[PDB]
Design an enzyme around this catalytic site. Structure first.
Site, PDB file in Angstrom:
ATOM      1  N   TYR A 114       3.043  10.535  -1.103  1.00 53.63           N
ATOM      2  CA  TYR A 114       4.290  10.212  -0.429  1.00 53.63           C
ATOM      3  C   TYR A 114       5.514  10.374  -1.318  1.00 53.63           C
ATOM      4  CZ  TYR A 114       0.977   8.389   2.980  1.00 53.63           C
ATOM      5  OH  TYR A 114      -0.063   8.282   3.879  1.00 53.63           O
ATOM      6  N   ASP A 120       0.819  -1.215   0.000  1.00 55.73           N
ATOM      7  CA  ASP A 120       0.000   0.000   0.000  1.00 55.73           C
ATOM      8  C   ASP A 120       0.859   1.275   0.000  1.00 55.73           C
ATOM      9  OD1 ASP A 120      -1.273   2.266   1.735  1.00 55.73           O
ATOM     10  OD2 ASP A 120      -3.029   1.098   1.120  1.00 55.73           O
ATOM     11  N   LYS A 134      -3.007   5.904  -4.008  1.00 58.77           N
ATOM     12  CA  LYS A 134      -4.099   6.822  -3.737  1.00 58.77           C
ATOM     13  C   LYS A 134      -4.059   8.164  -4.445  1.00 58.77           C
ATOM     14  CE  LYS A 134      -3.901   4.970   1.028  1.00 58.77           C
ATOM     15  NZ  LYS A 134      -2.491   4.508   1.046  1.00 58.77           N
ATOM     16  N   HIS A 167      -7.512   9.520  -1.176  1.00 59.66           N
ATOM     17  CA  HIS A 167      -6.768   9.694   0.071  1.00 59.66           C
ATOM     18  C   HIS A 167      -7.564  10.353   1.202  1.00 59.66           C
ATOM     19  CE1 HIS A 167      -2.320   9.740   1.368  1.00 59.66           C
ATOM     20  NE2 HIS A 167      -3.112   9.394   2.404  1.00 59.66           N
TER      21      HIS A 167
END
Length: 274
Positions: free
Chosen positions: A50, A45, A75, A106
């Site tokens: 990020y 995941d 996401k 998200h």
């Protein structure tokens, strides 16, 4: 025993335990995934926000596991709600994949209120086969109803903060009633503070010869939750996966249930992004 899988409402199958990859550098990410795939994880995941999807993509290539055997989740970031197609292709490119197994919004970011637009777009990308399953993260009951009321399409996953200190009995119940599979992020209550040190957990840890984190992860599993413990430490990535040789009793689960304090440790779904 073998790692269990969960069948989502849309018919797709998902490993019940996966590895969460957050902020970390490419170094940490590549090494963490190599370790996880090696120990048995088949669910990874990540998130576009990020900024390490490229590292994740490189780790998947390097791996021997076949694509078809991997369940990859990424996401849609907050400021991309109006352009999900552009965001997804950007993700797929960085991840070096032709499709994603699970695409999640998200955050709903109710202040901006473009989450419905995002969902409609995700519904269209799913039709084109670029996404197998679509779902959301940090969605409250009213956010979910709004999606259902406006599109008729229900998420197969609602990934929310859930741990012994905030068991989300209510949202969990509501998700299930609407055939939405609840998935826990921050399953160890970020560190275990106020959990690992509890008598109920410690005694459980000693009765089963497991670490407190292993007891807590088993708790999520026996509660019927899909769980994503986050870690980039080799020994802990392995420890968190060693939870298939035991199960908590109905009574033991009841004892852990008393720890619920409704204590949120992460960002607030109703205010984040606003």
């Amino acid at each position: 025993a073998n790692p269990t899988v969960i069948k989502l409402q849309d018919g797709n199958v998902m490993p019940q335990l996966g590895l969460g990859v957050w902020q970390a550098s490419n170094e940490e990410v590549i090494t963490a995934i190599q370790k996880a795939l090696e120990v048995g994880y088949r669910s990874i995941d990540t998130a576009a926000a990020y900024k390490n999807e490229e590292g994740v993509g490189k780790a998947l290539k390097n791996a021997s596991v076949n694509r078809e055997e991997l369940f990859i989740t990424t996401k849609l970031w907050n400021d991309d709600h109006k352009r999900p197609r552009e965001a997804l292709l950007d993700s797929l490119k960085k991840l070096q994949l032709d499709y994603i197994d699970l695409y999640l919004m998200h955050w709903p970011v109710p202040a901006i209120d473009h989450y419905v637009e995002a969902w409609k777009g995700m519904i269209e990308l799913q039709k084109e086969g670029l996404i197998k399953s679509i779902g959301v993260c940090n969605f409250q009951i009213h956010h979910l109803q709004r999606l259902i009321d406006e599109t008729g399409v229900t998420p197969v996953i609602n990934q929310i903060e859930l741990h012994p200190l905030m068991q989300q009995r209510q949202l969990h119940a509501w998700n299930a009633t609407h055939k939405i599979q609840t998935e826990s992020w921050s399953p160890l209550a970020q560190g275990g503070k106020g959990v690992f040190d509890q008598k109920v957990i410690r005694d459980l840890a000693d009765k089963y010869g497991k670490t407190p984190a292993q007891i807590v992860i088993r708790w999520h599993l026996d509660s019927g939750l899909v769980v994503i413990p986050k870690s980039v430490t080799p020994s802990r990535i392995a420890e968190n996966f060693d939870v298939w040789d035991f199960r908590l009793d109905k009574d033991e689960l009841g004892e852990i249930a008393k720890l619920d304090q409704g204590k949120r440790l992460g960002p607030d779904p109703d205010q984040f992004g606003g």
